CSV table of C-alpha atoms in Angstrom, one decimal:
chain,number,residue,atom,x,y,z
A,1,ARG,CA,55.6,83.2,174.8
A,2,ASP,CA,55.4,87.0,175.5
A,3,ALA,CA,57.3,86.8,178.9
A,4,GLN,CA,57.6,90.6,179.1
A,5,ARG,CA,53.8,91.0,178.7
A,6,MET,CA,53.2,88.6,181.6
A,7,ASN,CA,55.0,91.1,183.9
A,8,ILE,CA,53.1,94.3,183.1
A,9,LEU,CA,49.8,92.3,183.4
A,10,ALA,CA,50.9,90.8,186.7
A,11,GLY,CA,52.0,94.2,188.1
A,12,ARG,CA,48.4,95.5,187.7
A,13,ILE,CA,47.0,92.8,189.9
A,14,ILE,CA,49.0,93.5,193.0
A,15,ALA,CA,48.2,97.3,192.8
A,16,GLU,CA,44.4,96.9,192.7
A,17,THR,CA,44.6,94.9,195.9
A,18,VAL,CA,45.9,98.0,197.7
A,19,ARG,CA,44.5,100.8,195.6
A,20,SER,CA,41.2,101.6,197.4
A,21,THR,CA,42.9,101.7,200.8
A,22,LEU,CA,44.3,105.2,200.1
A,23,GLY,CA,43.2,108.1,202.3
A,24,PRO,CA,41.0,107.9,205.4
A,25,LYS,CA,38.0,106.5,203.6
A,26,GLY,CA,38.5,103.1,202.0
A,27,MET,CA,37.4,99.5,202.6
A,28,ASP,CA,39.6,96.5,202.8
A,29,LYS,CA,39.7,93.0,201.3
A,30,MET,CA,41.0,90.3,203.6
A,31,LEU,CA,42.4,87.0,202.3
A,32,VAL,CA,42.2,84.3,205.1
A,33,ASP,CA,44.8,81.6,204.8
A,34,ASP,CA,44.1,77.9,205.1
A,35,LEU,CA,44.4,78.1,208.9
A,36,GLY,CA,41.3,80.3,209.3
A,37,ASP,CA,42.5,83.2,211.4
A,38,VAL,CA,40.3,86.1,210.1
A,39,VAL,CA,42.3,89.3,210.5
A,40,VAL,CA,41.5,92.8,209.2
A,41,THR,CA,43.7,95.8,209.1
A,42,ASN,CA,43.7,99.1,207.1
A,43,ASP,CA,47.2,99.0,205.9
A,44,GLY,CA,49.1,98.1,202.7
A,45,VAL,CA,52.5,96.9,203.7
A,46,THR,CA,50.9,94.7,206.4
A,47,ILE,CA,48.9,92.8,203.8
A,48,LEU,CA,51.8,92.2,201.4
A,49,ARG,CA,53.7,90.2,204.0
A,50,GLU,CA,50.9,87.7,204.7
A,51,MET,CA,49.6,87.6,201.2
A,52,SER,CA,51.6,85.3,198.9
A,53,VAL,CA,52.7,85.8,195.3
A,54,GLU,CA,52.5,83.7,192.2
A,55,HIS,CA,55.2,84.8,189.8
A,56,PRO,CA,58.7,85.5,191.2
A,57,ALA,CA,59.0,89.0,189.6
A,58,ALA,CA,56.1,90.1,191.9
A,59,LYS,CA,58.6,90.3,194.8
A,60,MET,CA,60.5,93.1,193.1
A,61,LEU,CA,57.7,95.6,193.9
A,62,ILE,CA,57.4,94.3,197.5
A,63,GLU,CA,61.2,94.7,198.3
A,64,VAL,CA,61.2,98.4,197.5
A,65,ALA,CA,58.1,98.9,199.7
A,66,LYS,CA,59.9,97.7,202.8
A,67,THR,CA,62.5,100.4,202.6
A,68,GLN,CA,59.8,103.1,202.4
A,69,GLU,CA,58.5,102.1,205.9
A,70,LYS,CA,61.8,101.7,207.9
A,71,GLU,CA,63.0,105.0,206.4
A,72,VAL,CA,59.9,107.3,206.2
A,73,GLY,CA,57.2,105.3,207.9
A,74,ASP,CA,54.2,106.4,205.8
A,75,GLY,CA,53.2,106.5,202.1
A,76,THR,CA,53.9,102.9,201.1
A,77,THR,CA,50.7,102.6,199.2
A,78,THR,CA,51.2,106.0,197.6
A,79,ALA,CA,54.3,104.6,195.8
A,80,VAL,CA,52.6,101.4,194.5
A,81,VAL,CA,49.5,103.1,193.3
A,82,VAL,CA,51.5,105.3,190.9
A,83,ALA,CA,53.6,102.4,189.8
A,84,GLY,CA,50.7,100.4,188.3
A,85,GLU,CA,49.7,103.5,186.4
A,86,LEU,CA,53.0,103.6,184.5
A,87,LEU,CA,52.8,100.0,183.5
A,88,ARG,CA,49.4,100.6,182.1
A,89,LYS,CA,50.6,103.5,180.0
A,90,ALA,CA,53.8,101.7,178.8
A,91,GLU,CA,51.8,99.1,176.7
A,92,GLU,CA,50.1,102.0,175.0
A,93,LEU,CA,53.4,103.0,173.5
A,94,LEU,CA,55.0,99.6,172.8
A,95,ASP,CA,52.2,98.8,170.3
A,96,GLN,CA,53.4,101.8,168.3
A,97,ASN,CA,56.8,100.2,167.5
A,98,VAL,CA,58.6,101.7,170.4
A,99,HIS,CA,61.5,100.2,172.3
A,100,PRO,CA,61.2,99.8,176.1
A,101,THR,CA,64.5,101.7,176.6
A,102,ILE,CA,62.9,104.8,175.1
A,103,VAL,CA,60.3,104.7,178.0
A,104,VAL,CA,62.9,104.2,180.7
A,105,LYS,CA,65.0,107.3,179.7
A,106,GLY,CA,61.8,109.4,179.9
A,107,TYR,CA,61.1,108.6,183.5
A,108,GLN,CA,64.7,109.3,184.5
A,109,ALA,CA,64.5,112.8,182.9
A,110,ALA,CA,61.2,113.6,184.5
A,111,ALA,CA,62.2,112.2,187.9
A,112,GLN,CA,65.4,114.3,188.2
A,113,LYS,CA,63.5,117.5,187.1
A,114,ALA,CA,60.8,116.9,189.7
A,115,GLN,CA,63.4,117.1,192.5
A,116,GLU,CA,64.0,120.8,191.7
A,117,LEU,CA,60.3,121.6,191.6
A,118,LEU,CA,59.3,120.1,195.0
A,119,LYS,CA,62.0,122.2,196.7
A,120,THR,CA,60.4,125.4,195.4
A,121,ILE,CA,56.8,124.5,196.3
A,122,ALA,CA,57.8,123.5,199.8
A,123,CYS,CA,57.3,126.3,202.3
A,124,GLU,CA,59.4,127.3,205.3
A,125,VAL,CA,58.1,126.8,208.9
A,126,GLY,CA,59.6,127.1,212.4
A,127,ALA,CA,61.2,124.4,214.4
A,128,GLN,CA,59.8,125.6,217.8
A,129,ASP,CA,56.3,126.5,216.6
A,130,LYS,CA,53.4,124.5,218.1
A,131,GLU,CA,50.3,125.4,216.0
A,132,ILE,CA,52.0,124.1,212.8
A,133,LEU,CA,52.9,120.8,214.6
A,134,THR,CA,49.3,120.3,215.7
A,135,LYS,CA,48.0,120.1,212.1
A,136,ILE,CA,50.4,117.3,211.0
A,137,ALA,CA,49.5,115.4,214.1
A,138,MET,CA,45.8,115.2,213.1
A,139,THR,CA,46.7,113.9,209.7
A,140,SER,CA,48.6,110.8,210.8
A,141,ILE,CA,46.1,109.7,213.5
A,142,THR,CA,43.3,109.9,211.0
A,143,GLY,CA,44.9,107.0,209.0
A,144,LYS,CA,43.9,104.5,211.8
A,145,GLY,CA,40.3,105.2,212.6
A,146,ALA,CA,39.9,107.4,215.7
A,147,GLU,CA,37.8,110.6,215.2
A,148,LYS,CA,35.9,110.4,218.5
A,149,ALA,CA,38.4,112.6,220.3
A,150,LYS,CA,41.2,113.3,217.8
A,151,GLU,CA,41.3,116.9,218.9
A,152,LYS,CA,42.6,115.7,222.3
A,153,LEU,CA,45.0,113.0,221.2
A,154,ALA,CA,46.5,115.5,218.8
A,155,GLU,CA,47.2,117.9,221.7
A,156,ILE,CA,49.2,115.4,223.8
A,157,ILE,CA,51.4,114.2,220.9
A,158,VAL,CA,52.5,117.7,219.9
A,159,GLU,CA,53.8,118.3,223.4
A,160,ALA,CA,55.8,115.0,223.5
A,161,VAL,CA,57.8,115.6,220.3
A,162,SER,CA,58.6,119.2,221.5
A,163,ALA,CA,59.8,118.0,224.9
A,164,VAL,CA,62.3,115.5,223.3
A,165,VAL,CA,64.2,118.0,221.2
A,166,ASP,CA,67.9,117.7,222.1
A,167,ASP,CA,70.2,120.7,221.9
A,168,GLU,CA,71.9,119.5,218.7
A,169,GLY,CA,68.4,119.3,217.0
A,170,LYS,CA,67.7,115.6,216.4
A,171,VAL,CA,65.1,113.0,217.2
A,172,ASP,CA,65.4,109.5,218.7
A,173,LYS,CA,62.9,106.7,218.6
A,174,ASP,CA,64.2,105.2,221.9
A,175,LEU,CA,63.5,108.0,224.4
A,176,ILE,CA,59.7,107.7,223.7
A,177,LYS,CA,58.2,104.6,225.2
A,178,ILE,CA,54.6,103.3,224.8
A,179,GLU,CA,52.4,101.3,227.2
A,180,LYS,CA,49.0,99.8,226.3
A,181,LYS,CA,46.4,99.1,229.0
A,182,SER,CA,42.6,99.1,228.6
A,183,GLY,CA,40.6,100.2,231.6
A,184,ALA,CA,38.2,103.2,231.5
A,185,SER,CA,38.2,104.7,228.0
A,186,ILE,CA,40.5,106.5,225.6
A,187,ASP,CA,39.7,109.9,227.3
A,188,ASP,CA,41.9,108.8,230.2
A,189,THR,CA,45.1,109.4,228.2
A,190,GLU,CA,47.8,111.5,229.8
A,191,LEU,CA,51.4,112.6,229.0
A,192,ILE,CA,53.8,111.3,231.7
A,193,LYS,CA,57.2,112.8,232.1
A,194,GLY,CA,59.0,109.6,232.8
A,195,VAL,CA,58.5,105.8,232.7
A,196,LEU,CA,55.8,103.4,233.7
A,197,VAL,CA,55.9,99.7,234.8
A,198,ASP,CA,52.9,97.4,234.7
A,199,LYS,CA,53.6,95.9,238.1
A,200,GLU,CA,52.2,96.1,241.6
A,201,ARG,CA,53.2,95.6,245.2
A,202,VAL,CA,54.0,92.0,246.1
A,203,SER,CA,52.4,92.6,249.6
A,204,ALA,CA,50.2,95.1,251.3
A,205,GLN,CA,52.3,95.3,254.5
A,206,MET,CA,55.0,97.4,252.9
A,207,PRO,CA,54.6,101.2,252.7
A,208,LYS,CA,52.1,102.6,250.2
A,209,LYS,CA,53.8,105.9,249.3
A,210,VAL,CA,57.3,107.4,250.0
A,211,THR,CA,59.3,110.5,249.1
A,212,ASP,CA,63.0,110.8,248.2
A,213,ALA,CA,63.9,107.1,248.3
A,214,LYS,CA,67.1,105.6,247.0
A,215,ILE,CA,65.9,102.9,244.6
A,216,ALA,CA,68.1,99.8,244.3
A,217,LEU,CA,67.3,97.8,241.1
A,218,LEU,CA,68.7,94.3,241.0
A,219,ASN,CA,68.8,91.7,238.3
A,220,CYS,CA,69.6,88.1,239.4
A,221,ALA,CA,68.3,85.3,241.7
A,222,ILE,CA,69.7,84.7,245.2
A,223,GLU,CA,71.1,81.3,244.4
A,224,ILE,CA,74.4,79.4,244.7
A,225,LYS,CA,76.8,80.3,241.8
A,226,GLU,CA,79.0,77.8,239.9
A,227,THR,CA,82.5,78.2,238.6
A,228,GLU,CA,83.8,77.1,235.2
A,229,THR,CA,85.3,74.1,236.8
A,230,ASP,CA,83.0,71.1,237.3
A,231,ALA,CA,81.7,70.6,240.9
A,232,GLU,CA,78.9,68.2,241.7
A,233,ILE,CA,76.9,68.0,245.0
A,234,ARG,CA,75.8,64.9,246.8
A,235,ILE,CA,72.7,64.5,248.9
A,236,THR,CA,71.6,61.5,251.0
A,237,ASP,CA,69.4,62.7,253.9
A,238,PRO,CA,66.0,64.0,252.7
A,239,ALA,CA,65.4,65.3,256.2
A,240,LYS,CA,67.7,68.3,255.5
A,241,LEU,CA,65.3,70.2,253.3
A,242,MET,CA,63.3,71.3,256.3
A,243,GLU,CA,66.3,72.6,258.2
A,244,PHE,CA,67.4,74.6,255.1
A,245,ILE,CA,64.2,76.7,255.4
A,246,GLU,CA,65.2,78.2,258.7
A,247,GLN,CA,68.8,78.8,257.5
A,248,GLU,CA,67.5,80.5,254.4
A,249,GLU,CA,65.3,83.1,256.1
A,250,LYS,CA,68.3,84.5,258.0
A,251,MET,CA,70.3,84.6,254.8
A,252,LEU,CA,67.7,86.7,253.0
A,253,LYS,CA,67.0,88.9,256.1
A,254,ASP,CA,70.6,89.9,256.6
A,255,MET,CA,71.1,90.3,252.8
A,256,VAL,CA,68.2,92.7,252.5
A,257,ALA,CA,69.3,94.4,255.7
A,258,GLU,CA,72.7,95.3,254.2
A,259,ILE,CA,70.8,97.0,251.3
A,260,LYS,CA,69.0,99.2,253.8
A,261,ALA,CA,72.2,100.3,255.5
A,262,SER,CA,73.3,101.9,252.3
A,263,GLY,CA,70.2,104.2,252.3
A,264,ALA,CA,68.1,102.1,250.0
A,265,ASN,CA,64.6,100.7,250.6
A,266,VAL,CA,63.0,99.9,247.2
A,267,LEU,CA,63.9,96.5,245.7
A,268,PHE,CA,63.3,94.7,242.4
A,269,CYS,CA,63.7,90.9,242.4
A,270,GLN,CA,63.2,88.5,239.5
A,271,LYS,CA,61.5,85.4,241.1
A,272,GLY,CA,59.0,84.5,243.9
A,273,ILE,CA,59.6,84.7,247.6
A,274,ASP,CA,58.5,82.8,250.7
A,275,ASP,CA,55.2,84.0,252.2
A,276,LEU,CA,56.7,84.6,255.6
A,277,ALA,CA,59.9,86.1,254.3
A,278,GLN,CA,58.2,89.3,253.0
A,279,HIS,CA,56.5,89.7,256.4
A,280,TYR,CA,59.8,90.4,258.3
A,281,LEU,CA,60.9,92.7,255.5
A,282,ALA,CA,57.6,94.6,255.1
A,283,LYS,CA,57.3,95.5,258.8
A,284,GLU,CA,60.6,97.4,258.7
A,285,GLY,CA,59.3,99.6,255.8
A,286,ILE,CA,61.2,98.1,252.9
A,287,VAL,CA,59.5,98.2,249.4
A,288,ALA,CA,60.3,95.4,247.0
A,289,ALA,CA,59.1,93.8,243.8
A,290,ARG,CA,59.3,90.5,242.0
A,291,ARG,CA,59.3,89.4,238.3
A,292,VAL,CA,60.0,92.5,236.2
A,293,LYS,CA,60.4,92.7,232.4
A,294,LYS,CA,64.0,93.1,231.2
A,295,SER,CA,63.0,95.9,228.9
A,296,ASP,CA,62.0,98.0,231.9
A,297,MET,CA,65.4,97.6,233.6
A,298,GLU,CA,66.9,99.7,230.8
A,299,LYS,CA,64.6,102.8,231.0
A,300,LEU,CA,64.6,103.0,234.8
A,301,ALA,CA,68.4,103.0,234.7
A,302,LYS,CA,68.4,106.3,232.7
A,303,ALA,CA,65.3,107.8,234.3
A,304,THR,CA,66.5,107.4,237.9
A,305,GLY,CA,70.2,107.3,236.9
A,306,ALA,CA,70.5,103.8,238.2
A,307,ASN,CA,72.3,100.8,236.6
A,308,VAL,CA,71.6,97.1,236.2
A,309,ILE,CA,73.4,95.0,238.8
A,310,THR,CA,74.1,91.3,238.5
A,311,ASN,CA,75.5,90.5,242.0
A,312,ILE,CA,73.7,91.8,245.0
A,313,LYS,CA,77.0,91.8,247.0
A,314,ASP,CA,78.6,94.2,244.5
A,315,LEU,CA,76.5,97.3,244.9
A,316,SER,CA,77.6,100.9,245.1
A,317,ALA,CA,75.8,104.1,246.0
A,318,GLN,CA,76.3,105.5,242.5
A,319,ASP,CA,74.3,102.7,240.9
A,320,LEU,CA,71.3,103.5,243.2
A,321,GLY,CA,68.3,105.3,241.6
A,322,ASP,CA,67.2,108.8,242.6
A,323,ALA,CA,63.5,109.5,242.0
A,324,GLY,CA,61.7,112.8,242.9
A,325,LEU,CA,58.3,111.3,243.6
A,326,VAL,CA,57.3,107.6,243.6
A,327,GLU,CA,53.7,106.7,244.1
A,328,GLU,CA,51.5,103.7,243.3
A,329,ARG,CA,48.2,105.5,242.4
A,330,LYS,CA,45.2,103.9,240.8
A,331,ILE,CA,44.2,104.0,237.1
A,332,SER,CA,40.5,103.1,237.0
A,333,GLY,CA,40.1,99.9,238.9
A,334,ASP,CA,43.6,98.4,238.6
A,335,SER,CA,46.7,100.1,240.1
A,336,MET,CA,50.3,100.3,239.0
A,337,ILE,CA,53.6,101.8,240.1
A,338,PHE,CA,54.5,105.3,238.9
A,339,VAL,CA,57.6,107.6,239.2
A,340,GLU,CA,57.8,111.3,238.5
A,341,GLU,CA,60.8,113.5,237.7
A,342,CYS,CA,59.9,116.9,236.2
A,343,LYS,CA,63.1,118.5,237.4
A,344,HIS,CA,65.0,117.3,234.3
A,345,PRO,CA,63.4,114.3,232.6
A,346,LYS,CA,65.4,112.7,229.7
A,347,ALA,CA,62.6,110.6,228.3
A,348,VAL,CA,58.8,110.4,228.1
A,349,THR,CA,56.2,107.6,228.0
A,350,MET,CA,52.7,107.6,226.5
A,351,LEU,CA,50.0,105.7,228.5
A,352,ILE,CA,47.3,104.5,226.1
A,353,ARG,CA,43.9,103.7,227.6
A,354,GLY,CA,40.7,102.2,226.3
A,355,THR,CA,37.9,99.8,226.9
A,356,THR,CA,39.3,96.7,225.1
A,357,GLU,CA,42.4,95.4,223.4
A,358,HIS,CA,41.0,96.2,219.9
A,359,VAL,CA,40.7,100.0,220.4
A,360,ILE,CA,44.0,100.6,222.2
A,361,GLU,CA,46.0,98.8,219.4
A,362,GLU,CA,44.6,101.2,216.8
A,363,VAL,CA,45.8,104.4,218.4
A,364,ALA,CA,49.0,102.6,219.4
A,365,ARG,CA,50.0,102.3,215.7
A,366,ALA,CA,49.7,106.0,215.3
A,367,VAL,CA,51.9,107.4,218.1
A,368,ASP,CA,54.9,105.5,216.9
A,369,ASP,CA,54.5,106.9,213.3
A,370,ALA,CA,53.5,110.4,214.3
A,371,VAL,CA,56.8,111.1,216.1
A,372,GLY,CA,58.6,109.9,213.0
A,373,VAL,CA,57.1,112.2,210.4
A,374,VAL,CA,57.0,115.0,213.0
A,375,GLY,CA,60.5,114.3,214.2
A,376,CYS,CA,62.1,114.5,210.8
A,377,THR,CA,60.4,117.7,209.6
A,378,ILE,CA,61.9,119.6,212.6
A,379,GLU,CA,65.4,118.6,211.5
A,380,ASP,CA,65.0,119.7,207.9
A,381,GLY,CA,62.3,122.3,208.4
A,382,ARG,CA,60.5,121.9,205.0
A,383,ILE,CA,56.9,120.8,204.5
A,384,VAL,CA,54.2,121.0,201.8
A,385,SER,CA,50.4,120.8,201.7
A,386,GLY,CA,49.2,117.2,201.1
A,387,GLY,CA,45.9,116.0,199.7
A,388,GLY,CA,47.5,115.4,196.3
A,389,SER,CA,47.8,119.2,195.6
A,390,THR,CA,51.5,118.7,194.9
A,391,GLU,CA,50.8,116.3,192.0
A,392,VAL,CA,48.1,118.6,190.6
A,393,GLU,CA,50.5,121.5,190.3
A,394,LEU,CA,53.4,119.5,188.7
A,395,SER,CA,50.9,118.0,186.2
A,396,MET,CA,50.7,121.4,184.5
A,397,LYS,CA,54.3,122.3,184.6
A,398,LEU,CA,55.6,119.0,183.3
A,399,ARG,CA,53.5,119.5,180.1
A,400,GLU,CA,55.3,122.8,179.4
A,401,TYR,CA,58.7,121.2,180.0
A,402,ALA,CA,57.9,118.5,177.5
A,403,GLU,CA,57.9,121.0,174.6
A,404,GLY,CA,61.6,121.6,175.2
A,405,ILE,CA,62.5,117.9,174.6
A,406,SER,CA,62.1,116.8,170.9
A,407,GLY,CA,62.0,113.5,169.2
A,408,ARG,CA,60.1,110.3,170.0
A,409,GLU,CA,60.9,110.7,173.8
A,410,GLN,CA,58.3,113.4,174.5
A,411,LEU,CA,55.6,110.7,174.6
A,412,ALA,CA,57.1,109.3,177.8
A,413,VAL,CA,57.5,112.5,179.8
A,414,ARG,CA,53.9,113.4,179.2
A,415,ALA,CA,52.6,109.9,180.3
A,416,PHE,CA,54.5,110.2,183.6
A,417,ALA,CA,52.9,113.6,184.4
A,418,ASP,CA,49.4,112.4,183.6
A,419,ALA,CA,50.0,109.2,185.5
A,420,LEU,CA,50.1,111.2,188.7
A,421,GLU,CA,46.3,111.9,188.3
A,422,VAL,CA,45.4,108.6,190.0
A,423,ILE,CA,45.9,109.9,193.6
A,424,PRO,CA,43.0,112.4,193.3
A,425,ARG,CA,41.0,109.9,191.4
A,426,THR,CA,40.9,107.1,193.9
A,427,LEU,CA,39.9,109.5,196.7
A,428,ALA,CA,36.9,110.6,194.5
A,429,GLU,CA,35.4,107.1,194.1
A,430,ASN,CA,35.4,106.4,197.9
A,431,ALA,CA,33.8,109.8,198.5
A,432,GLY,CA,30.9,109.1,196.2
A,433,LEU,CA,31.5,111.8,193.6
A,434,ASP,CA,32.4,111.7,189.9
A,435,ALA,CA,36.1,112.2,189.5
A,436,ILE,CA,35.9,113.6,186.0
A,437,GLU,CA,33.4,116.2,187.3
A,438,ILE,CA,35.7,117.5,190.0
A,439,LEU,CA,39.0,117.0,188.2
A,440,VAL,CA,38.0,119.8,185.8
A,441,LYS,CA,37.5,122.3,188.6
A,442,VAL,CA,40.7,121.7,190.4
A,443,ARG,CA,42.6,122.8,187.3
A,444,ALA,CA,40.8,126.1,187.2
A,445,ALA,CA,42.3,127.1,190.6
A,446,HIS,CA,45.8,126.3,189.3
A,447,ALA,CA,45.3,128.2,186.0
A,448,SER,CA,48.3,130.7,186.2
A,449,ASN,CA,48.3,133.3,189.0
A,450,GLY,CA,46.1,131.2,191.3
A,451,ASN,CA,47.1,129.7,194.6
A,452,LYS,CA,49.2,126.5,194.8
A,453,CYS,CA,47.1,124.6,197.4
A,454,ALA,CA,43.5,124.1,196.2
A,455,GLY,CA,42.8,120.4,195.9
A,456,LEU,CA,39.9,118.3,197.3
A,457,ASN,CA,38.3,117.8,200.7
A,458,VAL,CA,36.7,114.4,201.4
A,459,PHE,CA,34.6,115.9,204.3
A,460,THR,CA,32.8,118.9,202.7
A,461,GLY,CA,33.4,117.9,199.1
A,462,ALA,CA,34.7,121.0,197.4
A,463,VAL,CA,37.9,122.8,196.6
A,464,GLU,CA,39.1,124.6,199.8
A,465,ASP,CA,42.4,125.8,201.3
A,466,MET,CA,44.1,122.8,202.8
A,467,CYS,CA,46.4,124.9,205.0
A,468,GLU,CA,43.5,126.2,207.0
A,469,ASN,CA,42.1,122.7,207.3
A,470,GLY,CA,45.3,121.2,208.5
A,471,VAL,CA,46.2,118.7,205.8
A,472,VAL,CA,50.0,118.8,205.4
A,473,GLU,CA,52.8,116.2,205.2
A,474,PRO,CA,56.6,116.2,205.3
A,475,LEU,CA,58.7,116.9,202.2
A,476,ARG,CA,61.0,113.8,202.4
A,477,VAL,CA,57.9,111.5,202.0
A,478,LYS,CA,57.3,112.9,198.5
A,479,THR,CA,60.9,112.9,197.2
A,480,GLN,CA,61.6,109.4,198.7
A,481,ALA,CA,58.3,108.0,197.4
A,482,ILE,CA,58.7,109.3,193.9
A,483,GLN,CA,62.3,108.2,193.8
A,484,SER,CA,61.5,104.6,194.8
A,485,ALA,CA,58.6,104.4,192.4
A,486,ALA,CA,60.6,105.7,189.5
A,487,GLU,CA,63.5,103.2,190.3
A,488,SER,CA,61.3,100.1,190.9
A,489,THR,CA,59.5,100.3,187.5
A,490,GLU,CA,62.9,100.1,185.7
A,491,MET,CA,63.4,96.6,187.0
A,492,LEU,CA,60.4,95.3,185.0
A,493,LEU,CA,61.0,97.4,181.9
A,494,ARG,CA,64.7,96.4,181.6
A,495,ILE,CA,63.9,92.7,181.0
A,496,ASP,CA,62.3,90.6,178.3
A,497,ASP,CA,63.2,87.0,179.1
A,498,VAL,CA,63.3,84.5,182.0
A,499,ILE,CA,66.0,81.8,181.7
A,500,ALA,CA,65.0,78.6,183.4
A,501,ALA,CA,68.1,78.3,185.5
A,502,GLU,CA,68.3,75.4,188.0
A,503,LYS,CA,70.3,75.5,191.2
A,504,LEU,CA,71.6,79.0,191.2
A,505,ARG,CA,72.0,79.8,194.9
């Protein structure tokens, strides 16, 4: 009957499911499917994918949320929490004989004006500074649950983003690898200036450590090839399989011998090998490997300047790797292969450690997002204090700007400004303090000539300088989040009917 009303009421149900998950403190509400896999995660976008939807219009708010992650990588819940607030204020005006179009024009006028205010509040920082980059690092890691040694993990991530700053001044998400492996604890994390493979030596007869060795990385299986033309083989004497073993050992011995003549020694195969074959090759001091991930063949090619080879016969000296120090040291119990190259490393890799698979995965979801928010701010060079202090300042200036606009439209620009007061309200409930009792003091700091940073601290619980505490965020996350929220709400306001079309493709 109402149709339009069914949308604004439905929009408030999806927001409440991911409203209390804002900020560090905040429980979660899991919805196990019919299968029974009980999974829990402190994230918003991760729950929208598994969680289904009833009405078809509900997918409109989920589509815009996907773009916020692939582009920015943080703040998806910050855009949906402010969306539901607008839908709750719209009905307050529609009952007063107001047309929906009058509310849409108000958000567009306030959204465009907010773009000019955020640029003035944002401060200027350096692109080579380190102390400023250490504060932003502690803000992203806090969003995953890891305060046992955050001071240490924040010191290794700030050095990685600074060592991957090309001359042109950009950031790439490919030259920063990640490897998870639980063993001792999280304190065993270290920044490696190269790559790392989770393999070991196929045999103990080969050398244990070498120096200045020409690595030869292969990628195939020593087998008989076949041309495009059909060619079948016939067999009739089963007593030939035994004779083929003796004829195969010499084929592999002379083959590996040709690789040693070119100055190489280290090898990387892709399948098993005879037990006795490696004996003749290990006594001569020839390192080798078997079964390696294809993803590792790409990073080793750039780290050691090597290149993937498909035919062992076609191998040149230029395609051989050049490592400065290759050693297979231990890492608390288990051992792995390692390669160093501090002379001029082009990439880096973070080795995550822990006691189980549940703790290493938490910190793993923070290193990939930290380099993103920290890699973009270096290109633009503009940041602003977080903690909702930006919305508290604009909440006062938007009221003065509303006086300039006359008519029946000023009721919309005021509702949008007051709608931004939900961010500091949700964080108050989780902290255990009355929001209305603290929301009156924050406005006192931003009276007129006061500072533009006082907000709220979930730890101590009082208005304090957020800059000294280290609570800042990029500037693109705010402009992009507010831009997506202001554009997504228009999809539900500019509609008042649902035709029952069949077979539309």
